[PDB]
Design a protein around this ligand. Sequence first.
Ligand code: MG
Ligand code: ZN
Ligand code: ZN
Lengths: 222, 170, 56, 115, 150, 1112, 112, 93
Amino acid sequence: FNPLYVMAQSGARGNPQQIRQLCGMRGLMQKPSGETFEVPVRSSFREGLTVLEYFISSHGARKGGADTALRTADSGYLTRKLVDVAHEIVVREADCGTTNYISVPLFQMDEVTRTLRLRKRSDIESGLYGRVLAREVEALGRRLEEGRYLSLEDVHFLIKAAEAGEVREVPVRSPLTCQTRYGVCQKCYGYDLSMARPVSIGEAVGVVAAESIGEPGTQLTM
Amino acid sequence: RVDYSGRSVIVVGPQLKLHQCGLPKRMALELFKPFLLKKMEEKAFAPNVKAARRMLERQRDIKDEVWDALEEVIHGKVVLLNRAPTLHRLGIQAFQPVLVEGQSIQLHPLVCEAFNADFDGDQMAVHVPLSSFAQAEARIQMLSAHNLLSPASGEPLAKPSRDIILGLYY
Amino acid sequence: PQEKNSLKDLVYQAFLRLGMEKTARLLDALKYYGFTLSTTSGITIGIDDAVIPEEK
Amino acid sequence: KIAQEPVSLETPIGDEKDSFYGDFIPDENLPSPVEAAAQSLLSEELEKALSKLSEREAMVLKLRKGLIDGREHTLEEVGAYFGVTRERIRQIENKALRKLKYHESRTRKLRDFLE
Amino acid sequence: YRAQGVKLHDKHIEIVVRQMLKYVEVTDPGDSRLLEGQVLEKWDVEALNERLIAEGKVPVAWKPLLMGVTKSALSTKSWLSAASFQNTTHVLTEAAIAGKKDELIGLKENVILGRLIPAGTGSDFVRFTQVVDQRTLKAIEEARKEAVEA
Amino acid sequence: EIKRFGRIREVIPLPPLTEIQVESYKKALQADVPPEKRENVGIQAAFKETFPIEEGGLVLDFLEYRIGDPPFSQDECREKDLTYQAPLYARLQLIHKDTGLIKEDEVFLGHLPLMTEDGSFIINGADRVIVSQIHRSPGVYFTPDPARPGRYIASIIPLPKRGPWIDLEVEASGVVTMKVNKRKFPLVLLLRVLGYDQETLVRELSAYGDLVQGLLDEAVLAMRPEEAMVRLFTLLRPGDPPKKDKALAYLFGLLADPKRYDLGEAGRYKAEEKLGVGLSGRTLVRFEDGEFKDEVFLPTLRYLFALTAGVPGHEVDDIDHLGNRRIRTVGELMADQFRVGLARLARGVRERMVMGSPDTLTPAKLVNSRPLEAALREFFSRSQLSQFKDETNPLSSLRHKRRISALGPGGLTRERAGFDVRDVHRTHYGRICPVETPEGANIGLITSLAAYARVDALGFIRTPYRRVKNGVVTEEVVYMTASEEDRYTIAQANTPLEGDRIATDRVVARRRGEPVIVAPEEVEFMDVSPKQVFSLNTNLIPFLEHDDANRALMGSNMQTQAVPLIRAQAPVVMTGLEERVVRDSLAALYAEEDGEVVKVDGTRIAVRYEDGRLVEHPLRRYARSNQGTAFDQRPRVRVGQRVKKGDLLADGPASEEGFLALGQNVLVAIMPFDGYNFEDAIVISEELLKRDFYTSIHIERYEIEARDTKLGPERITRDIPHLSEAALRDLDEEGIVRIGAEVKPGDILVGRTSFKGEQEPSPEERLLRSIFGEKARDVKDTSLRVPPGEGGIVVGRLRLRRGDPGVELKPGVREVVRVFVAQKRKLQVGDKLANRHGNKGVVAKILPVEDMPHLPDGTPVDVILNPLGVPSRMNLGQILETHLGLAGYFLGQRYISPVFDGATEPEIKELLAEAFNLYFGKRQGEGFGVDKREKEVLARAEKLGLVSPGKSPEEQLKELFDLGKVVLYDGRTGEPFEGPIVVGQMFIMKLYHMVEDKMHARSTGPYSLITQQPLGGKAQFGGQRFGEMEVWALEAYGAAHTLQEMLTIKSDDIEGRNAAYQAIIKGEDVPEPSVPESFRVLVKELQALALDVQTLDEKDNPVDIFEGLASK
Amino acid sequence: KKEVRKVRIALASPEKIRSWSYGEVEKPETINYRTLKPERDGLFDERIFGPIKDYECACGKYKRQRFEGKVCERCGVEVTRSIVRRYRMGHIELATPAAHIWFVKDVPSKIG
Amino acid sequence: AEPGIDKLFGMVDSKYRLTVVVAKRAQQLLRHRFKNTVLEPEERPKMRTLEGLYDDPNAVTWAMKELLTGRLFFGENLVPEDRLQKEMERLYP
Ligand SMILES: [Mg+2]
Ligand SMILES: [Zn+2]
Ligand SMILES: [Zn+2]
């Protein structure tokens, strides 16, 4: 029932490393050259840090800060670029009339780790959710229809079937294969992720895409 | 840069609902001024538009009449709230004028995560759509209450946060 | 016990099944209740609330 | 005072790279929406406050004001157009003025625009 | 993105990528007016080849040309788009030299123009939608039968 | 009662904190120093380097220079809006070589600004400060090639404007090339006139083998000095024909010239002690007997080629090392620009000689003021290093003065700064504060000087270290530079001492910033105090050891933004540096000698000193600052008590009894409250507004200018044509507002009438004019009316009219009228509050005293901060401040807890135990037991195990109390909070940002002339900028008409916004716009580029957006 | 009157430039040092670019909306809105022809 | 908020169609001063005011409830535009 642990577990506030710095050792530090220091900082914040520890940790710290700032700049950069390239992409036709598609694999392969492994659920959702089935799918004694919009439940079912090993590939209509002129069309695109239903015509998905990729642009350090 | 616009530092909205924000009184008076001129034209007190405008400009005589009239033009209409930097489309969301004392704009706690807003002195902007067409666009597809799931992810954006999680977990 | 992921799947399931308005209501309800209960809990942070393992 | 030079409109303001000197200059040459609306309401309200007069005196007034061709028709000109003497025109306009004094003393619609 | 812990759907990235490789380099122009190595859009050469097959002529062979998002957007049909982006001088020069006509298909050129944006409610699909009520509908419903009698 | 903690006792006091600016500008002036005995450095260095000049057969010369007395004092210059400056008179003797004519004659120079006692100047009636600059020290250095991984490139370099950069780089042919001013040429070709040939370059030169042959070119070695002089003059300066004398003069001015090329004295010394050689002057080469002789190039090529061989003793220099970096202080900069202007003046003199009458000319006719005047004017007004002083509080100006910037002219800029100059080097330790720095694109660039850090004559920052001999510490404190520190091994200030000598066998030490555990036998030095490792603001954070670096940074930066309060109080727990902060800030009045107070009142504190003299100290009361924060001095002394020397008389805005008072001490409860504290928002008890806590005074000043326009003269008068009686009330005589009058937004501060441009009234207009019969009169009303959102009371009154003494007003302008307006600002919803630990916040709704989480004695808390802000930002210092604040509130004493020598957990716990004994003891002394609700909370705390089971409620409440947590009752219910909640005294700060200033909205205002866009900012009554990203947002939504209104009607479209405002006024729906009107500007601009812009139609036909306008 | 669905950009011939031109600016002044009126042939000249005041000519002979489009006989100022000074373009006839620096300096130089 | 928004979404394929519909309907209502309404006195969206409970002046809301009823017909090329507006003014002064 401790406040720190509770805020951590519930997802209210704080991460294991912050709690690590607030309870256990603050860890090992990195000198400006980039090679890690030979001696640790021992005591946590609540124990208090000696002058030296604080100094080295300040090297690392300000390094981090400069990183974040330059990174917001570059985020604005990339965002504007993407917006400029994808702006013309808009839902126009309900059906562009193409038989072309892409097959999304449910299994990746860790190299030198040999055996094919089932892709983590979030990735599979990231490629399958909202998608329209290119062609018929047969798994687990049930069938999935042509031109069906896959819901979350449908994706989880396809995962269950992938574990069941009847499907290693998911045929799906994609913007990539879409024949729509100066943009993409409905079924080739998918659900409108905000409303969890088939995308409304006239939706400009290029700008939406550009922003969608753009916002995360400020969170990449590690 | 645009006419019919403003900005202020932000304050949490705990009593307020999702489709609402706390748009302050003075800011609203200046923002909606033409509408207020017409509503003062219809509702007695001054003969015409000019009398209303001259009334409002000199001598801040503001009286319950003009405030209730302000809430007469306000009702049902929504305004757009903006937080810089604008990354998502969710960086701009529709909310309602609610006349409140104090110079700070009140914002809903759930949509903060969408604007990437904390109150350290962060500031937000207010724009008012004029035409009934634009108003329709604002209340229908641009409304905060109507936008929940993240268009980027497909997982719901407007979300319980901090204290809320703490209590439900609790 | 309810937490971020659980509450999230709750909200999404509610959106997918019930509807938009019902979910807005649900959200604000969880807001009011969550806040009031957070107040009632009296959850606070002292210096000894960051307890050290004796093994350190 | 003559010797001094003009200032470059592009002269930087503050340490900011986003601002010039010239774009801080307002336009007084161009009527503001409030001003156009003000002139509109003035012309309209004056038009309605004019209509309660006799036809002739109103016509005379708007001949004097420039409400017709924009120019200013004196005395004799008005007398020449309506076929009467100029003095009569004078008395006519004075009378008009005072009648407007009454009705405006009532409605208070035109009591503004007094700046 | 997944390494960082940020989850986003593949659709967006796919759209951007399709915009990246959208260009083609011409090899053996065949019977067309094209020249070797001339760069143009996918759908354009596709259509041209369709018509050429229908016309009983030799189609145009080509190769997939993928470029960075910057140059991809820089090579776009709309000159206002490329002008507003960056490298304004080069664009404008090539543009005016060729005397290219912007058809205002994209949204941001219309944004420059201050014209109703081709997307959203301004989409040509939903913007011509008409709205009537029963009584007015019946009035104008009589309007059609009184025209033939006059 | 005030309690001190920690065992570390600083043997040396903090040196004067304003000393960098004051002393540096002192050395560059030498005012009291006689013109005879002066130091030849700074301004006199400029004089001696610009003189004598000879070029008929005139010979000038200098003699002395004289500082004038200021024509106006500080205050006068400030309220006249004139730079504070004094005339500088150079005494300069003119001679004739051939004639023998001596006309000595004094002369003028210009006006030189004087630095005040605080260390800031005044330019144009505005207090400004010149920040210290950081660049790399002069000398020569060696770094590995960016292009070639296998070798080391060489670099030679002097002071800026003192001559060009030099690079010795081996190109990969095997041949060598030199680069100065962007160009290429072999070294031998330069060895040239320096008296070297094939043999002299192969003689010693090879310990090498392979490295000798890449140097030699026989074609160049064949030709001898003046020929290859012509050659290098042909290469390096292609513009003029390759003359021999031109080559001689030019390349003499490039290198051998002591004036034109000045290599730093520090660079002279360092380069002399690096290459293993010695140097006569500061010049790269010497011009002697008509031939050039080598100084620099030979030993630096020696060291270059040696290091590249791999021979021991030679190594690559560290670029970011502070031993290779120096500080430009204010005096050196001022003298630099001074000598530039002096050079321009030299050229003026040189132009004026060759005309007129070369026989008789006084130096008065030969010399002009403007070159130096405009040079200094340009440096003080324009230059980036010169910026607006921070007057928000005393500590603001103090830190602003101690600030070190890498930016500015001669330095670096935002773009070329990577992780190189932004990072923290090993040697930043006792010199540059590792934490304090802006949280912006400027991180790592602009930093602050450390507390004990000092800048010597050579510009090298040095820091105090106590020498220790065989475990025994010496009272001798040595100031050591970066390299000097690098040589020795230094212990730590917290190392255990047993009465002046070392105790432990394992001592914490360092060799060149590398932590090492080592014995007392080999330690030659020790830190004076941990305080020297941080800046001033950082040193004001108690328990800094428990706070993360980021939030510490934020803490200091926010301490800078501090606004003074009326009741403002010094923190309960302090680090002890606050006193010296208020002292060296010079915002407080002290006793200069021993004496007695003979009077007080709020104007003059008079003291009769022991020396017999009666000296009164005038008190500044409510003086407007730069940011508007009031500067006030409240005397604390009784009449008739004898003061010591240096003793306090009157406080400052930010001072309490000689202690720094930034914010106030309030009672904080850490807990969630109804989601009002959500996201670091701050609930506040309304009680603060009752006690006038966090109430600040802000004076804003407005000015107005009566001119003579060609139309007619402007005039300040009470008479205004259409003005009603009631609006003219406080205007008493000349049309100026009286003193002590409340001014509402829209009210007239001062009246003014300017003749309108003569034009007709419109037909309708003149119809109106006739109807009311009110004479259309002449002049129109220009009067100054206080801007919206602003208002207050009138204190100050100033009128400067021309034709009157003491004031010279610019041409065309009759009189300027200026009014001080002071405002009383209580804490409002939306205002900003923060602590010393870097916890930001906005005021989110205030709460009535009725419902508050209170104590069993009925004492309500003053804030209710949110705990959720704590674990992410990782600042635990505020927690400790809250605990000690609780103990301090109860036992009624304050604390001093220095940085890194602090109070500890057991100490604080003990104080909590004592305070609890007093508190609960007083509870039972008043005849009360333990409340039932408390038994409930104690029970549920026992189940979760916050208290030991089996112990009585007294002992459990005791165990809970020292934890900082007490029982709290909800003022709304009366029921206790389920869990215990930490409460106590926290030091919290009202900052600069307020809703009062930052709330603005606009409907229809002024528009720009070029394009019809509305103006920016609040001051201009501007509209909000809608960015491209926001356009992308609207497009993403798919709102077409919203985006349309944004792009047309509501922004710049003339007919659109007009017809729209018309429609809303008449109650319609706004029409569809047409032309954005900025787009038409775009079209015609494109046409100005001779590009035909055709706007076509559905069928490829011209559509003219200019309607009957440009058609022709 | 008609919709604008298309915008093109091309090279403006000298003839087109002269067609746009309401006159040549001969004299390199701006305004008189005192009267602050546009100089005779100067850059700000009303005789070509149009009047500073709506419908009011320079001399002040034709004063009203009544007269429209008629050139005044002294100043040569067209009676019309004062807004035309934003649109109407002038020109400078060059003695010896010169090149537009764009088609020269552009990365793939066009004339080159 | 705007109740029935889910059903409103269900009424049309693309949302922007709905937005266009509500916009134009609110336009008609503002034009004719709420006399072209298909609503009934009980269904009229009443704004609460101390002076009295009046008709909500907001046309958007009116259009929302109006389309929520279903008495409204919408579509492309439904009726000639000219005759539409013509008799639209013919019915209501
Ligand atoms: Mg913030
Ligand atoms: Zn498709
Ligand atoms: Zn004329």
